[PDB]
Design a protein around this ligand. Structure first.
Ligand SMILES: NC(=O)C1=CN([C@@H]2O[C@H](COP(=O)(O)OP(=O)(O)OC[C@H]3O[C@@H](n4cnc5c(N)ncnc54)[C@H](OP(=O)(O)O)[C@@H]3O)[C@@H](O)[C@H]2O)C=CC1
Ligand SMILES: CN(Cc1cnc2nc(N)nc(N)c2n1)c1ccc(C(=O)N[C@@H](CCC(=O)O)C(=O)O)cc1
Length: 186
């Protein structure tokens, strides 16, 4: 079990979702990077694990579920079994990480990626330990219904750079955004 990382795309107003989907038009390069980041493994024969709440799992188009090349995990206190297509189900973020420690998975998984949503971000974000937040800053306001918790800047530092992450403003469909990385250790 290597790195613990969060990944999110937020609008100027700190908003990640609107009625089950994103607040913005689909940015395919944005999705490209999301997929590239979460799927790439720095260790041969090992895979990345993605942790998502049940409403995030349900917002991924059916056809792209479970996300490919990735070990998929849903979080939920209601469901009895993983939703069709899922690989694992856990009742807590602490349980999900322990499973990583199980020999089943202990040799198959490299980094673990938290893909949301909020409640889920919030807890991981405050998890004791070393962590990184890969944030896409979508540069405009989008009416949303679900938000990203605030970044505590007194704990989380913005890096001037990071290998494999474009440092310049992207713009697609007239919507500009930038990629950022925060690092923590406490
Ligand atoms: N722009 C972006 O980066 C992202 C946008 N989105 C979008 O935002 C929305 C996702 O929203 P959100 O409401 O936060 O949904 P989640 O995807 O977090 O779904 C919440 C469900 O997940 C379970 N759950 C969540 N956190 C935990 C935990 N720590 N322990 C146990 N169970 C947990 C609960 O399930 P139960 O009720 O079964 O107990 C809760 O009802 C959609 O609009 C989606 O499209 C989502 C992710 C990233
Ligand atoms: C609703 N949603 C959650 C979502 C969307 N954008 C994000 N963007 C970032 N930066 N971080 C997130 N956590 C994130 N999550 C989705 C929706 C679709 C796919 C998806 O179908 N993903 C493909 C990428 C397919 C594509 O390239 O368009 C994959 O193979 O991972 C992922 C997440």
């Amino acid at each position: 079990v290597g790195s613990l990382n969060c990944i999110v795309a937020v609008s100027q107003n700190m908003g990640i979702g609107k009625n089950g989907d994103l607040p913005w038009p689909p940015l395919r390069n944005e999705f490209r990077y999301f997929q590239r980041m979460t799927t790439t493994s720095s260790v041969e024969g090992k895979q990345n694990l993605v942790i998502m709440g049940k409403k995030t799992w349900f917002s991924i188009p059916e056809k792209n579920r479970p996300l490919k090349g990735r070990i998929n995990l849903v979080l939920s206190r209601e469901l009895k079994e993983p939703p069709q297509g899922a690989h694992f189900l856990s009742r807590s973020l602490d349980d999900a990480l322990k499973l990583t420690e199980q020999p089943e998975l202990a040799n198959k998984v490299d980094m673990v990626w938290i893909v949301g949503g909020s409640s889920v971000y919030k807890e991981a974000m405050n998890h004791p330990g070393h962590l990184k937040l890969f944030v896409t800053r979508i540069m405009q306001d989008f009416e949303s219904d679900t938000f990203f918790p605030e970044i505590d800047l007194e704990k989380y530092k913005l890096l001037p750079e990071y290998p494999g992450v474009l440092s310049d403003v992207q713009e697609e469909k007239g919507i500009k955004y930038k990629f950022e990385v925060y690092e923590k250790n406490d």
